[PDB]
Structure formats: structure tokens, C-alpha cells
Paper text:
Geminin coiled-coil domain-containing protein 1, GemC1, is a member of the Geminin superfamily. The three members of this family, Geminin, Idas and GemC1, all share a conserved coiled-coil domain. GemC1 has been identified as a Geminin homologue, and is also implicated in DNA replication but at a later stage than Geminin. GemC1 has been shown to mediate TopBP1- and Cdk2-dependent recruitment of Cdc45 onto replication origins, enabling pre-initiation complex formation and initiation of DNA replication.
Residue numbers in the entry:
A (entry chain A): 69 to 132
B (entry chain B): 69 to 129
Amino acid sequence: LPDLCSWEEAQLSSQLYRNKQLQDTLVQKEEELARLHEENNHLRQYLNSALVKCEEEKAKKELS
Amino acid sequence: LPDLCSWEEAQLSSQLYRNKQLQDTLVQKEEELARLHEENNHLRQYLNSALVKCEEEKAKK
């Protein structure tokens, strides 16, 4: 029992360490995701806004 | 001692399960990031192309 207990405790420490590393990576990923979602959406909006104005201009020009 | 051992065993089990969950979440997050990076690049490419064409249309005379 005491040799098993010491082995189990070491495995637990190693597991908690690996999980902490995963957890930290996951925080970094979530914020990278949030950044990209916001940038993609804004870029999308900007493109749509500019392209629409280009077409509005052609419409009112090409009427006479 | 015997109380600590059972607590540590139960924690090994919970933490193995936690590891799996974190691993599963991470593969899903990486897939999502890979797609958003692809989209971001395409959006920047499209933007560049639209700036050029916007500019060339200002061949205004």
C-alpha cells in the first residue's frame, strides 16, 4: 500500500500539471478566437459598406 | 493515511476525465481557429482586390 500511494500521488501531481497547461492554452485560444471573430466581422461590415456605396454611385450616375 | 489515499485516487479519476474534456475542447477550438484564419486571409485578399479595382475605376479622365 505505501509504495502504491506514493506512485498514485506522483501521477496526480503530473496530471494536475498537464491539466493546468491545457487550461492556460485554452484561455489563449479563446481570446485569439474572440479577436478573430471581431476582426472578421468588422472587415466584413467595412467591405459591404464600401461596395454598396460604389454600387449606389454607379446607379445614380448611370441614370443620365 | 487511508483517507488521503482514497481522496487521491478519486482525484486521479476526476482529473483524467477533466484532461479528456480539455483535450476535446482544444481540438474543437483549433478547428474553429483554423477556419477563421482561412476566412480572415480570404477577406484580406478580397479587400486588396477591391481596392485595386476601386483605384482603376478612378481612370476618370
